[PDB]
């Protein structure tokens, strides 16, 4: 014999060390071994924290926000059980995404009156789209149905940003910035001031106050406070003049051409322009901090990496630049595209870039070493992509691709085969959404990986 229940007999920390050397499958089986083993495993937070981190379902910095969200969802479970349930759900979903023989359920819904969709937000069980038909459409991603259409813009909608609690902000060719309440189904505020098309926008929170920042073809950016919710009007509250607008903060002048892209966090906001430069702003002081010069052509996309205090810029000059926002200095120039680089995304571990030649590049989010490289086979310009540490989904004319970033392999190339264009793609967990064009019409596609 000489057999011994080592897991029970050993001190807790040591048996814990043993479970950390196991894959999740073995840990799951171990839960069914005996009451004591069951008790020992469900005792440690770290065990499930490590597994969640190791599968890129969460980062160390994101852990607290995950825990709170889990507490809200499962009020009557221990932290350990919350983390275990979260892990099992996430690993189940991921396996479906990775299984080339898995096929998601598909829901196809009417899009806009025009075939081109210009912007899409996917947050809080809402899918929200804008187009040149002057309309904003809101969808329920849980029941996978159309909810309502938000009308009011006198021009096409070209920028959208979801805030919180069914509140959203839009920018249009009518030069207005509009605040909407989904649950009231109306526009609550119309902010005028821009002298040209509102091209882009972002929302930041600094000292528990949300601000709207809007870039325009008038070479400027306008800063506005996001209005608070009401308790117990003449909606929409129209503000024809900025100085007489209590939600108006000020104008940020600096660029000599259209403000194409904007990215902010806290009091720091970065703008990119067709004048080949970027500016780092302090919207608390309403002052220019740095001017990032060096690109030889239009800036199409920028990301403010606030975690590392850096700026990433993508240009028509085919280059990507990394800037140190502690001193305003150039850090790196990345050369991995031979065409306009107009799309950037940052996940916890990957900076991802996509170009007009159909190329997509993955760079390490910290040292920018080359992690992956993809190319749409028809060499059509990348119109949209979305990415996590585990999955890349990309779109272009006649192509919609899902890539496994671990194995580097294409999982699915034909899920949205009937689409002619992919205007916008976004995913979170079990849900993947795409605004597409097919035979001269726009549609919203919803893919379910549960």
């Amino acid at each position: 014999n000489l057999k011994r229940d080592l897991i029970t007999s050993l001190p807790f920390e040591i048996s814990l060390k043993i479970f950390n050397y196991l894959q999740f499958e073995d840990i799951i089986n171990s839960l069914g071994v005996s009451q004591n083993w069951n008790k020992i495993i469900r005792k440690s937070t770290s065990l499930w924290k490590k597994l969640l981190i190791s599968e890129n379902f969460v980062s160390p910095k994101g852990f607290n926000s995950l825990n709170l969200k889990l507490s809200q969802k499962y009020p009557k479970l221990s932290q350990q059980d919350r983390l275990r349930l979260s892990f099992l759900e996430n690993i189940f979903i991921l396996k479906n995404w990775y299984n080339p023989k898995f096929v998601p359920q598909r829901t196809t819904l009417r899009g806009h009156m025009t075939s081109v969709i210009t912007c899409l937000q996917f947050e809080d069980n809402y899918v929200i789209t804008g187009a040149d038909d002057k309309m904003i459409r809101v969808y329920d991603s849980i029941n996978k149905k159309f909810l309502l259409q938000l009308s009011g813009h006198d021009g096409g909608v070209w920028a959208l940003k979801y805030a919180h609690g069914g509140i959203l902000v839009s920018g249009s060719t009518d030069r207005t910035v509009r605040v909407w309440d989904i649950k009231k189904g109306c526009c609550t505020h119309v902010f005028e001031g821009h002298n040209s098309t509102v091209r882009c926008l972002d929302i930041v929170e600094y000292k528990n106050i949300k601000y709207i920042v809007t870039g325009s073809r008038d070479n400027t950016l306008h800063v506005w406070k996001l209005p608070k919710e009401s308790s117990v009007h003449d909606y929409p509250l129209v503000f024809h003049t900025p100085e007489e607008n209590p939600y108006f903060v000020g104008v940020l002048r600096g660029h000599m051409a259209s403000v194409r892209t904007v990215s902010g966090h806290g009091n720091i906001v970065v703008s990119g322009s067709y004048d080949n430069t970027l500016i780092v702003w302090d919207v608390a002081q309403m002052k220019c901090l740095y001017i990032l010069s060096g690109h030889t052509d239009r800036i199409y996309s920028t990301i403010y990496d606030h975690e590392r205090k850096r700026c990433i810029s993508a240009s028509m000059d085919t280059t990507i630049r990394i800037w140190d926002l502690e001193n305003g200095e150039l850090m790196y120039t990345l050369q991995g595209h031979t065409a306009l680089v107009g799309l950037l995304r940052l996940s916890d571990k990957f900076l991802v870039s996509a170009a007009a030649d159909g190329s997509i590049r993955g760079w390490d989010a910290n040292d920018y070493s080359r992690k992956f490289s993809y190319h749409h086979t028809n060499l059509s310009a990348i119109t949209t992509f979305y990415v996590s540490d585990n999955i890349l989904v990309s779109g272009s004319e006649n192509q919609f691709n899902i890539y496994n970033l671990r194995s580097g392999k294409l999982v699915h190339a034909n899920i949205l085969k009937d689409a002619d264009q992919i205007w916008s793609v976004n995913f979170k967990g079990k849900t993947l959404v795409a605004a597409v064009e097919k035979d001269g019409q726009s549609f919203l596609e919803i893919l379910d990986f549960s």
């Binding site: 098309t197 059509s380 004319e397 205007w423």
Partner: peptide
């Protein structure tokens, strides 16, 4: 086509 739709001039 560069993949990025743009509004038309005002």
């Amino acid at each position: 086509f560069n993949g990025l739709t743009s509004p038309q001039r005002s």
